[PDB]
Design a protein around this nucleic acid. Structure first.
Lengths: 79, 132
RNA sequence: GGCUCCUUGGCA
RNA sequence: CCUUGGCA
């Protein structure tokens, strides 16, 4: 089972700092990551995509706990 | 002459960017990006590979150079790795088409960040090359 | 031409 | 249907 996450923000440095934290949290809990892939800036909006290809129960817990800046909006899909 | 290099620079930036964010083996990360982009052309693959292998081998001196025209961890992820790619190609590969790399590198930054980031990178990358 | 590929947004 | 890009 995998997870796909897309992050968006109107501040690109804040965005990439958010992606880094997620990656660290995921790896800290025994998870495995693919990406991230940066998408083209569109209408002043920066976005990134990240795949979680391996995860533990601890990984899900931590992702639920994490409080991202409100400016960073998250979209999560299991598959 | 030498249009395949534009896509190769995009490939290489993507790798350095995710190397910076993940801190895993560059070789394996390069393989990920190649697969994701579905790169088939031989010269596109090989120039991208050379770009990354160069940036990685000389990472310490590259960073030291950049820091002389600024600490490097203050920069954003897009800005810092674009600068790394640029210094790699212009100086450690001694590009004979420096005008092209400036254009391509700055476009990369504009594409994944914004105009401001693009101008900061262009201005820093210029001071660097000027010194060279 | 991508009916034998992905990606972004707008509309609808 | 139009559009940002990748593959190029």
């Amino acid at each position: 089972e995998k997870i796909r996450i897309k992050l968006r923000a109107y501040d690109h440095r804040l965005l990439d700092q958010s992606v880094k934290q997620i990656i660290e949290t995921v790896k800290r809990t025994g998870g495995v990551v693919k990406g991230p892939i940066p998408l083209p800036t569109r209408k002043s909006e920066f976005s990134r995509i990240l795949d979680i290809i391996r995860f533990t129960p601890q990984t899900i817990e931590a992702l639920m706990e994490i409080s991202l800046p409100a400016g960073v909006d998250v979209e999560v899909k299991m598959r | 002459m030498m249009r395949y290099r534009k896509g190769a620079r995009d490939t290489a930036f993507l790798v350095l960017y995710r190397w910076d964010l993940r801190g895993e083996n560059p070789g394996e990360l390069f393989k990920e990006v190649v697969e994701e982009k579905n790169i088939k052309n031989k010269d596109a693959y090989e120039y991208a590979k050379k770009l990354v292998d160069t940036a990685v081998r000389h990472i310490e001196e590259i960073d030291s150079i950049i820091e002389k025209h600024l600490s490097i961890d203050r920069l954003g992820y897009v800005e810092r790795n674009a600068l790394r790619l640029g210094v790699a190609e212009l100086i450690f590969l001694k590009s004979k088409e420096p005008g092209r790399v400036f254009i391509d590198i700055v476009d990369l930054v504009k594409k994944y960040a914004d105009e401001k980031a693009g101008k900061f990178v262009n201005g820093v990358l210029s001071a660097i090359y000027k010194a060279y």
